[PDB]
Amino acid sequence: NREDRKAKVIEVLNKARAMELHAIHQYMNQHYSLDDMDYGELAANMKLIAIDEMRHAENFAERIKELGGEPTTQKEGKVVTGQAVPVIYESDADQEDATIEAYSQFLKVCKEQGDIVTARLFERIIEEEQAHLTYYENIGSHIKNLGDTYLAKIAGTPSSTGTASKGFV
Amino acid sequence: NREDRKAKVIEVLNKARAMELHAIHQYMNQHYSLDDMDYGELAANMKLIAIDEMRHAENFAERIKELGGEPTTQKEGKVVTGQAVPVIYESDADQEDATIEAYSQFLKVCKEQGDIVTARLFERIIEEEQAHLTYYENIGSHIKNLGDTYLAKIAGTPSSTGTASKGFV
Numbered sequence: 617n618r619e620d621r622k623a624k625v626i627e628v629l630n631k632a633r634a635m636e637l638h639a640i641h642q643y644m645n646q647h648y649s650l651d652d653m654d655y656g657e658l659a660a661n662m663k664l665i666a667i668d669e670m671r672h673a674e675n676f677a678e679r680i681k682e683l684g685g686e687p688t689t690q691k692e693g694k695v696v697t698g699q700a701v702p703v704i705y706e707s708d709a710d711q712e713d714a715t716i717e718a719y720s721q722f723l724k725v726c727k728e729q730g731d732i733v734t735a736r737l738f739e740r741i742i743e744e745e746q747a748h749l750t751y752y753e754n755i756g757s758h759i760k761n762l763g764d765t766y767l768a769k770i771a772g773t774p775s776s777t778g779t780a781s782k783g784f785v
Numbered sequence: 786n787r788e789d790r791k792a793k794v795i796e797v798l799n800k801a802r803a804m805e806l807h808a809i810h811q812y813m814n815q816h817y818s819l820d821d822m823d824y825g826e827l828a829a830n831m832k833l834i835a836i837d838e839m840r841h842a843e844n845f846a847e848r849i850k851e852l853g854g855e856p857t858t859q860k861e862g863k864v865v866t867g868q869a870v871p872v873i874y875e876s877d878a879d880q881e882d883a884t885i886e887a888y889s890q891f892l893k894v895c896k897e898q899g900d901i902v903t904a905r906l907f908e909r910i911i912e913e914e915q916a917h918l919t920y921y922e923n924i925g926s927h928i929k930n931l932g933d934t935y936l937a938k939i940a941g942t943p944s945s946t947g948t949a950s951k952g953f954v
């Protein structure tokens with residue numbers, strides 16, 4: 617039934633959205649650590665990736681509203697704090713790869729429920745996740761192979777992500 | 786699948802409701818004829834049964850709303866007019882028996898859809914439909930076995946169904 621179809625898509629959309637809220641908090645917590653450690657270029661790209669996750673959360677929420685549902689406000693799982701730099705990139709690569717696997721299953725549900733608009737949304741966001749995955753794998757590999765030589769290059773670099781973002785005040 | 790289940794129950798509820806809307810118009814059409822004939826007692830009971838059907842239509846509508854549906858406004862089947870007195874009871878008896886058969890089917894769907902509240906609503910209404918059936922069966926029999934001897938007894942009796950209907954004005 618139509619209603620049936622909508623409910624099942626809203627469910628995978630809220631599951632995905634919950635994963636995005638987790639990622640925002642997880643990535644920003646690592647950003648606070650990298651910034652504190654004064655590894656500016658690393659801190660900056662971590663925050664830019666977090667902002668892509670914010671955009672995903674928002675796109676998911678907007679489609680949930682188009683389908684008449686209520687966007688979840690709760691993140692999936694727990695944020696790991698106090699990770700060492702190698703652990704940050706290893707676990708973030710792991711998480712990105714798991715997110716792509718999950719969204720790929722959610723997409724198939726969309727296809728089964730005859731929801732082309734939502735499946736296209738998953739497809740576009742999955743391609744962004746792949747860009748995130750490649751990034752994290754590359755940094756992990758530099759840290760693996762080069763160690764402190766690589767740290768020494770990032771030490772003291774600019775941490776700016778650009779102009780402060782649009783706000784009300 | 787909550788939405789499949791609500792949708793399948795709402796479908797038999799709207800089906801039963803359209804059988805009630807037809808019944809209301811069918812029995813009141815016969816009431817106007819009986820009243821015109823001045824067979825008071827028969828006219829009064831025919832309107833009282835119509836009012837019972839109004840209450841069934843309403844109960845079906847309210848449950849449909851609880852389940853998030855839209856109560857139908859269309860009646861099932863055609864109203865037959867100018868029915869003679871023997872045909873009124875014979876046809877009302879047949880229609881009540883057909884309704885009990887239909888609703889026992891609808892009850893079945895409710896139970897299959899795990900809708901206990903709606904199943905109980907049908908069981909309760911089915912027992913009222915049996916009261917109507919018995920009534921029509923008895924009148925048809927008297928008319929068939931005693932003919933005009935029984936009608937002379939009904940002639941000129943009061944047709945009042947009680948105090949005037951609560952209204953806005």
Ligand code: FEC
Pocket residue numbers: 640641644645667670671673674677689777779780781782783
């Ligand atoms: C959408 C959305 C969500 C999800 C909320 C939801 O419930 O769906 C959302 C969630 C969050 C959450 C948590 C945090 C808090 C992170 C933390 O401290 O753990 C959180 C934090 C930040 N957001 Fe965020 N967001 N977000 C935008 C949209 C969304 N954001 C847009 C747009 C911009 C654009 C800013 C700009 O262009 O200047 C933006 C920028 C930031 C900055 C950057 C500040 C700066 O450099 O000035 C920080 C920090």
Ligand code: FEC
Pocket residue numbers: 809810813814836839840842843846858948949950951952
């Ligand atoms: C419920 C409901 C429906 C279905 C509406 C829907 O679309 O769901 C509904 C539908 C109809 C329809 C047609 C008719 C018109 C019949 C015709 O003329 O063919 C129709 C006709 C009558 N209704 Fe009716 N109904 N109905 C109530 C509930 C419902 N009624 C309740 C309650 C009372 C309570 C009256 C009282 O207590 O004084 C009540 C009374 C009457 C009287 C009584 C007049 C009198 O003696 O003053 C007549 C005639």
Ligand SMILES: [Fe+3]
Pocket residue numbers: 636639668669672741745
């Ligand atoms: Fe994402």
Ligand SMILES: [Fe+3]
Pocket residue numbers: 639669712715744745748
């Ligand atoms: Fe990502």
Ligand SMILES: [Fe+3]
Pocket residue numbers: 805808837838841910914
């Ligand atoms: Fe009825």
Ligand SMILES: [Fe+3]
Pocket residue numbers: 808838881884913914917
């Ligand atoms: Fe009936």
